[PDB]
């Protein structure tokens, strides 16, 4: 229904003479690209991370990114005068595009300053965030007047180059991005909820994609006290979820944890509590 | 301005079984600015061979990082995730509870 490709940058200005530049590329929540600051080159994290692009196209992009990172850093360091009151400060960029199953792609380029929205790119125009006053206004004047060809480069990249790349990247990675991975589950005790009370914990780990259902059970009866935590990341593209239950002293025998997930289909995981209680 | 304090969650990839190879994860999220020190610890000492995701951030511009290391638990060993950040007066150490993990909803 909706898939995104994001190129992000983080520019950390420590003082007038020292800054850091970092960046990466993401297919939804999956990191597909890194950036090597030592050598100024793209890091292709998967065998399919080139999508349908040729090496010449990617080399063009690499030179564009190296030049952008260096030149943005130096123009900010110039315009940031002596200050040292503003330092340290941090600039974040989130640019990219979205493919939608029924509609046209979306493209975007958003900038934050010290964690707050600063400005964004709207088709032809750099637009200050209403919430970041003077500074946003000032920067946008310059971006709209002085850097006017960089602007058509940006528009072409986010509106044309990015959705083309994303389509080819989804196609090259199709037998990874549509994978199904089955979780495992295990039970443990948890911290005491109170005197004469126990906490049972059902850990579910290694599933992909993220939608999942977990309930504590007594036979076929779902248990009221079931409480799910957040869906947390594992390395190598799977997820983790904890489901707890508080139970009265003398009542835990016969309880089980039941897991439903797309990768199982009609073979729910059912794990019985066998003690520690 | 503004500054946001990291949230620290510690959990294992597989059931905690002594002598069985496993992965220890530390998910550190919701912080700003990006400058941070995150270390996985074994008996108080930084684990030197770890992996971490590249820096990324959420829709609200707060940063997040996933740390992980291969480890083999035993009954005596204590594992933790330690974080220092400008929002933190003193480094914060989040001990890994083997049974519960150490999460923050
Ligand atoms: C960074 C982290 C990387 C992570 C790895 C990512 C790896 C990954 C595979 C990347 C694939 C990304 C997909 C394919 C697309 C994604 C676009 C992204 C969403 C949008 C990001 C745009 C920013 C970042 C670039 C800024 C523009 C320069 C700043 C332009 C500066 C000058 O350029 P300019 O064109 O104006 O040059 C002039 C021209 C004119 C005539 O035009 C001439 O007269 C004159 O002489 C000059 O040559
Ligand atoms: C060419 C490679 C990438 C190009 C990107 C364009 C760089 C733009 C540099 C932005 C620096 C602007 C900061 C100026 C600070 C300022 O203008 O201060 C406002 C106050 O003076 C208001 O009174
Ligand atoms: C700027 O910060 C860097 C990194 O901490 C440091 O090495 C350098 O000495 C600083 N430069 C100054 C304060 O002029
Ligand atoms: C104190 C100086 C703050 C500089 C604001 C950074 C604006 C960078 C936006 C550039 C996007 C291409």
Residue numbers in the entry:
A (entry chain A): 6 to 282
B (entry chain B): 1 to 105
What did the publication describing this PDB structure actually write?
Whereas mice only express CD1d, humans express a functionally diverse family of CD1 antigen presenting molecules, namely CD1a, CD1b, CD1c, and CD1d. Here we focus on mycoketides, a class of mycobacterial lipids presented by CD1c. Certain T cell responses to MPM require both a phosphate and a β-linked mannose unit, which protrude from the ligand binding groove of CD1c. To determine the mechanism of epitope display, we determined binary crystal structures of CD1c-MPM-1, -MPM-2, and MPM-3 at 1.7, 2.0, and 2.1 Å, respectively.
The synthetic mycoketide lipid moiety was used here to generate three new MPM analogs with predicted chemical stability. These synthetic analogs comprise a carba-mannose, where the ring oxygen is replaced by a methylene group (MPM-1), and two C-mannosides, where the anomeric oxygen is replaced by a methylene group or a difluoro methylene moiety (MPM-2 and MPM-3, respectively). The lipid tails and phosphate of all three MPM analogs were anchored to the CD1c protein. Despite this, the mannose headgroup of all three MPM analogs showed considerable conformational flexibility. The phosphate group was sandwiched between a hydrophobic cluster including Leu69 and Phe72 of the α1 helix and Val155 and Thr158 of the α2 helix. The phosphate was unable to establish stabilizing interactions with CD1c, except for hydrogen bond formation with the Thr158 Oγ atom. This was observed in the MPM-1 and MPM-2 structures, which accounted for its reorientation within this region. We also observed a considerable movement of the CD1c α1 helix in the CD1c-MPM-1 and CD1c-MPM-2 structures compared with the CD1c-MPM-3 and native CD1c-MPM structures, with up to 2.1 Å difference at Leu74 Cα, which appears to be ligand-induced. We detected a trace amount of PM in our MPM and MPM-1 stocks and detected higher amount of PM in the lipid extracts of MPM or MPM-1-treated cells. Thus, the formation of PM from MPM or MPM-1 during storage or in antigen presenting cells can account for the activation of the DN6 cells. Recognition of MPM-1, however, was reduced, as seen by a reduction in IFNγ expression by CD8-1 T cells and significantly increased EC50.
